[PDB]
Amino acid sequence: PSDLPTTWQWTSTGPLVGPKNDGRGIAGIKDPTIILINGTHHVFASTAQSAGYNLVYFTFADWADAPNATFYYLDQAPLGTGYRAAPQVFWFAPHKLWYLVYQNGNAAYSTNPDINNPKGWTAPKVFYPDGMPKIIEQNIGEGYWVDMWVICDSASCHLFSSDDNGQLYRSETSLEQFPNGMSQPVIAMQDNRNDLFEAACVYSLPDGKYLLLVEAIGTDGHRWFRSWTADSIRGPWQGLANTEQNPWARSNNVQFDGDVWTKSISHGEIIRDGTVDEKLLIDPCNIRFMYQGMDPSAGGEYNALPWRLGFIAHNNPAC
């Protein structure tokens, strides 16, 4: 793709979004999905603690207002209590409904006619009503079925997911059938688990190509992103910036404006503006990526790690 560089450089904010002192005991705010509508950002994120995961909505105009944005917990909607994590939001234009895609042990979705109403999200329905696909059971190993992502073109809608074991899965259905009818997935891409771990993003580009981002665990133990491009959602995928020396986003290509608050660059999303619909279009000339990070000296149980959200802004746009 002509308007993407092969090497990437970023500037990061400080940690802007963390847990509230509200009695819920949340340790981390994680895995954001973010869209921008006429100056207003809308975010959904995981709440993480060792007792479980659920979902939160918040909104702000300027990024400086993110730290004080009110949290609207989606367990107050019909979406409800239970396990829910790692959301993706988009407008599905055929239905004139927003969709929120997330995991619950299966691949799930909720709908809402108005993104501004966090109480409006439906109880989950599942993309795979017969349970975990056999292909994922055969390949998951000691992993977990995570990180659900939809992208459609004008004919077909695809559902991507990971197993924390080095597979990236893809199912499809027609545009007209969505959300129903998802195929049994194929393995879209496969690597060793640390090199193709979780947190996929699949975007469309104004030149009609596609961008795939996947989170990886580096030799130093810290999270980073690898990238590929393709002419089809179905692949094949060509490496863009997918090595530690030439990463999509990693400690070695992110400059901090203040303190270096994280070494991991982990589960995030590009800010989508303009159309915020099912085609998951981005503007390659103005990429900003909301991400999660943490104090690199912290340890302990994964679910209680002190994940916070910031932004990286792309320094070297190619258009």
Ligand SMILES: [Ca+2]
């Ligand atoms: Ca995600």
